């Protein structure tokens, strides 16, 4: 539904990068590829992304502590595997809801690239969700509403409505 190269152009501006790179794609999985200005070609969504995070000089997006960085890769793997999701997205939503009951962010208390990425990858789903389901997945709703209104993140992505209380 949203190509990973389209995702990376969107991330560049999320981060606040002014420069915008040409991105390729390779094969039928259509993996994103960067003919790079610092080594051999970069490949995959989360690798390029890590790079851009670094280009932006915002390293604290991949975690500070060893243990937050392990959490950050955990949600990065999760995004490439379970999110890029056909028959049942509910099972994911249920799980994430429980994970998110005691957490503002996907890393414990901090904003990381996990939040941005998991948000973009879930966006097409949470859009197609009913008013009833958003109640059922309360913590997901909260976290998402939070990420949409995080500074600079949403860009031109659709706003999902979330009855305030």
């Amino acid at each position: 539904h949203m190509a990973a190269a389209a995702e990376l152009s969107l991330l560049e501006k999320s981060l606040g990068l002014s420069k915008g790179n040409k991105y390729s794609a390779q094969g039928e999985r259509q993996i994103p590829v960067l003919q790079t200005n610092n080594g051999p070609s970069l490949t995959g969504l989360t690798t390029i992304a890590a790079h851009l995070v670094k280009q932006a000089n915002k390293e604290y997006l991949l975690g500070s502590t060893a243990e937050e960085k392990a959490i950050v890769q955990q949600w990065l793997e999760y995004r490439v595997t379970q999110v890029d999701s056909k028959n049942d997205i509910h099972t994911l939503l249920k799980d994430l809801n429980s994970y998110l009951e005691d957490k503002v962010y996907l890393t414990g208390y901090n904003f990381t690239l996990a939040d941005i990425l998991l948000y973009y990858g879930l966006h097409r789903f949470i859009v197609d969700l009913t008013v009833q389901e958003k109640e059922k997945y309360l913590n997901v709703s909260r976290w998402f509403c939070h990420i949409q209104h995080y500074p600079g993140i949403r860009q031109h992505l659709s706003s999902v409505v979330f009855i305030k209380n």
């Binding site: 009951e101 957490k103 208390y109 209380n165």
Partner: protein, 166 residues
């Protein structure tokens, strides 16, 4: 130079939260002894918790402590009343903190987007509430009030205020 003197036995937590939240927007000292009051032109003073929070949030507009809408302003005031009435002395606490659990469901901040007076104020009074402390050691809390309390607790200027005044 605006200076506030804090009640040395019972710091008004939340007052200093705002002070440490507004250090880099206006010149502020903190002194101790006496009672908790704030001096601004020292012919004009404020000596009540919710006055001082509002005044600092109004003067340091560079901070976002008062919100952006007029609606958000109204909420922020609402929250200060709520905490100063319903979280001051407990009676119907269950229905008191049901409501704080209930509206925190879809909100990261009480505010909507970012930290505002509502938070500093509510969190400070909650903390000093021992009935809610009893919910904590018995691990029977409202789940949304917990993350919210823990989230804010963990934060930078929130930890410093603890360290000086516990």
């Amino acid at each position: 130079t605006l200076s506030l003197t804090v009640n040395s036995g019972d710091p008004p937590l939340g007052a200093l939260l705002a002070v440490e939240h507004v250090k880099d927007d206006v010149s502020i000292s903190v002194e101790e002894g006496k009672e908790n009051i704030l001096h601004v032109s020292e012919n004009v003073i404020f000596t009540d918790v919710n006055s001082i929070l509002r005044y600092l949030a109004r003067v340091a507009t560079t901070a976002g402590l008062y919100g952006s809408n007029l609606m958000e302003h109204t909420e922020i005031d609402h929250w200060l009343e709520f905490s100063a009435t319903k979280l001051s002395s407990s009676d119907s606490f269950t229905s008191t903190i049901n409501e704080l659990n209930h509206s925190l469901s879809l909100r990261t901040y009480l505010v909507g987007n970012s930290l505002s007076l509502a938070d500093l104020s509510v969190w400070a009074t909650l903390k000093g509430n021992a009935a809610w402390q009893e919910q904590l050691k018995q691990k029977k809390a409202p789940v949304h009030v917990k993350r919210w309390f823990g989230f804010l607790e963990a934060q930078q200027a929130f930890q410093s205020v603890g360290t000086k005044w516990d």
